[PDB]
Amino acid sequence: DVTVVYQNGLPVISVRLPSRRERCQFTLKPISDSVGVFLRQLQEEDRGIDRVAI
Amino acid sequence: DVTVVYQNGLPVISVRLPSRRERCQFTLKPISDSVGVFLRQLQEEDRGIDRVAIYSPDGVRVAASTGIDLLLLDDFKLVINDLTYHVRPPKRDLLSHENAATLNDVKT
Amino acid sequence: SPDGVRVAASTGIDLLLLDDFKLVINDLTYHVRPPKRDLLSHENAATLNDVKTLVQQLYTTLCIEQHQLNKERELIERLEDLKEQLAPLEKVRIEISRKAEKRTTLVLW
Amino acid sequence: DVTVVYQNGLPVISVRLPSRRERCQFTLKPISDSVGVFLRQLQEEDRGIDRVAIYSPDGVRVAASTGIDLLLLDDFKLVINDLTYHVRPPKRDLLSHENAATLNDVKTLV
Amino acid sequence: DVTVVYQNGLPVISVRLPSRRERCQFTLKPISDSVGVFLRQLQEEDRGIDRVAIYSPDGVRVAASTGIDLLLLDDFKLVINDLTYHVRPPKRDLLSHENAATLNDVKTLVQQLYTTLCIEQHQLNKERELIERLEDLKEQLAPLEKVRIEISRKAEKRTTLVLW
Amino acid sequence: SPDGVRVAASTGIDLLLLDDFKLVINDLTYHVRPPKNAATLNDVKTLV
């Protein structure tokens, strides 16, 4: 499943991408990052993510 | 897995798309369709497919121009990403190969 | 389809409307069942469906469209065979049809 | 490494594409096609191919829009980015004696 | 094989490319650049490269946004169209892991505060208090400005007389 | 690059000229010597 844990001051989130059944991880800077930009990083990571919301 | 079977004069190909683990099915006109357009049709169905190619059973990669009829004559490996579904259901009735025979069966 | 499999992005409408089919929105599954009106005998449709593919194979088992394009290409060269033989006869006729015309404009004057 | 064989009266080249070390096999229409459009296909299987050309042993460049049957009937150099394979095209089998006659009826019916 | 060695204090990735098998090298600023750029840069250097994805030492793959230095901290497998080049970057962490941890503890612990009580929201309010204070004086100047615009005009209209 | 390693086709111009290299045209090797920020443990002691 999904888990988030902090590393080097930033939180990394190891989502489970749908295609490739792959487990990608994101280092997102939580001061100047809206979900509006963390999601793009999901889709543009593997466009197979049709819809994604929180 | 993946299987191809004929319906209403055309072959339907019921691949399993990766995202959502759906089982999409394409009807593809075996005359005016090259794998160059069945694949591009396969991606745009669900863009989550990095690479998609078609392998003749001996590892040799099928082209991007062969017409599906030319391909459907035998089996072939359809590889989407890491997975390799090798379809061998095309149910070729090429038992006789006899043009005189099939024509006789046609007219029959 | 009536079951889980997904209709592609290229299936023709009539090829789809043959039976009922679930149509899904962003969060809903509208369950559509169009009126069935083909009325061709199902088994007969099959024995025709057999014919269609059976011809289809014959059409490509022996590369017809490779032979059609050959037949046409054989026609071109024949045209380009005659159109060659014309080139000698054309000049000597372009000559006379000038000379014998150069007279008829004289007598015309 | 390059081979030309025949499936269903059609030539089937077997190149050795660079980017994957993977053999792709085109089929060619010896009438409609042309090295002008065959090369274009040879690109679209691996864009990593940039300097690609093809020519007869002496003839240093068979021009585009050359009938494939012209090229096909004799060996030729196939130049991929650096590897230049020389093909061994098979001499077409001759069965056009009289079957073609009774076949040219079959074909024009189907 | 591929490897990264530092030069000028920058990382130079000495990759081997599939199409043109010839060791091309990449430079990349460990701050401004991110894998989403270097990868995409390597994506455009060659063409036959079709699907590249940089992988953590295990199955986990890195994002398209992780900063290079955040990646170069340890080993990582880099995958080309059909191969898994296994990079081993030079160990350059140069900080006690526990101390690195207790600082990593601080960094988050600060920001947690920085957003627990909308500190960012308070800075704007501070400035928005400065604007009005300026706009409190600047308007309070508008009465005195008129009479001083007149006086200045008059006293100047008189000094140009004596000047003449 | 001096080691014969072909530099990237999109490396930084400044990073190119930051060091010696060997520009080439069809045959030549115009060996050119133009004139004259990774995070580190030394620097981190300063932030603390």
Structural contact between residues E66 and E53, judged by C-beta atoms closer than 8 angstroms: no
Which chain A residues contact residue E66 at CB under 8 A?
26-27
Chain D residue with Cα closest to E46:
D48
DSSP code string of E130-157: HHHHHHHHHHHHHHHHHHHHHHHHHHHH
Helix (H, G, I), strand (E, B) or coil at D104: helix
CA–CA dist E54, E40 (Å, integer):
11
Name, in order, each residue with C-beta under 8 angstroms of F23's C-beta and a sequence gap of 6 or more. F29, F30, F31, F32
Q: Do E26 and E33 touch, CB atoms closer than 8 A?
A: no
- Residue F5: Cβ within 10 Å count: 15
Do β-strands B76-80 and B52-55 pair in parallel, antiparallel, or remain unpaired? antiparallel
- Technique used by the depositors: cryo-EM
Q: Given an 8 Å threshold on Cβ–Cβ distance, is F11 in contact with E30?
A: no
Interface of D with C (CB under 8 A): 8-10, 29-32, 103-104, 106-107, 110
Q: Which residue type does E70 have?
A: L
Name the nearest CA neighbour of B13 among B31, B29, B25. B25
The partner residue sitting opposite B63, judged by closest CB among D22, D25, D103, is D25
In this structure, are residues E53 and E61 in contact, taking their beta carbons and an 8 Å threshold? yes
Bridge partners of B6?
A: B11
Partner residues linked to E27 by β-bridges: E12
Interfacial residues of D (vs B; Cβ cutoff 8 Å): 7-8, 10, 14, 17, 22-27, 41, 44-45, 103, 106, 109-110
CA–CA distance, D47 with D31 (Å, rounded to integer) = 26
Nearest C-alpha neighbor of B42 from the set B79, B72, B90? B79
Residue of E nearest to F41 (CA): E94
D33 vs A28, B90, C69, D71, D85, CA distance in Å? Answer: 52, 28, 11, 11, 21
DSSP state of B15: -
Closest of B45, B87, B80, B40 to residue C6, by C-alpha: B45
Cα(E138)–Cα(E143) distance, integer angstroms: 10
Residue appearing with tokens 């300026």: E134
Q: Can you say whether the dihedral through the CA atoms of A41, A44, A48, A50 is positive or negative?
A: positive
First and final CA of chain C: distance in angstroms?
86
Would you call B65 exposed, middle or buried from its count of C-beta atoms within 10 A (0-12, 13-18, 19+)?
A: buried
Q: What is the DSSP letter of A19?
A: G
Structure tokens belonging to residue E159: 């000094």
- On chain E, the residues whose CB falls within 8 A of the CB of B48 are none
Residue E156 C-alpha from the chain's centroid: 55
Amino acid at C63: C
CA distance B43 to B37: 10
Residue whose pair of structure tokens reads 């000049």 in the numeric block: C91
Residues of D in contact with E18 (CB under 8 A): 18-20, 48
Burial code (b: 16+ CB inside 10 Å, e: under 16) for C35-52 equals eeeeeeeeeeeeeebeee
DSSP state of C36: P
Q: How many whole angstroms separate alpha carbon C32 and alpha carbon C51? A: 31
3-state secondary structure at position E11: strand
User: What angle, 0 to 180 degrees and rounded to 10, lies between the N-to-C axes of helices C42-61 and C64-108?
Assistant: 70
C-alpha distance from C28 to closest chain B C-alpha (Å): 16
Which residues, in sequence order, are CB contacts of E26 under 8 Å at separation 6+?
E12, E13, E15, E38, E41, E42, E45, F8, F11
CB under 8 Å to C74, separation ≥6 — which residues? Answer: none
Q: Which residues are paired to A27 by β-bridges?
A: A12
**Resolution of this deposited model, Å:** 3.6
3-state class of D26 per DSSP?
coil
Please give the Cα distance from E60 to C30 (Å, whole number). 39
CB burial class (10 A; 0-12, 13-18, 19+) of residue E27? buried
What is F1-48 written as a DSSP string? -TTSPEEPSSS-HHHHHTS-EEEE-SS-EEEE--------HHHHHHH-
Place of tokens 């295990």: E58
Return the sign of the alpha-carbon dihedral for residues D46, D51, D56, D62.
Answer: positive
CA distance C15 to B7: 10
In terms of phi and psi (left: phi > 0; alpha: psi -120 to 50; beta: otherwise), the region of E130 is alpha
Which among D90, C8, D86, D15 is positioned nearest to B65, based on CA atoms? D15
Paired tokens of A16: 């489970």
| Distance from chain centroid for Cα E152 | 52
Please state, in angstroms and rounded to a whole number, the distance separating the CA atoms of residues C49 and C44.
Answer: 8
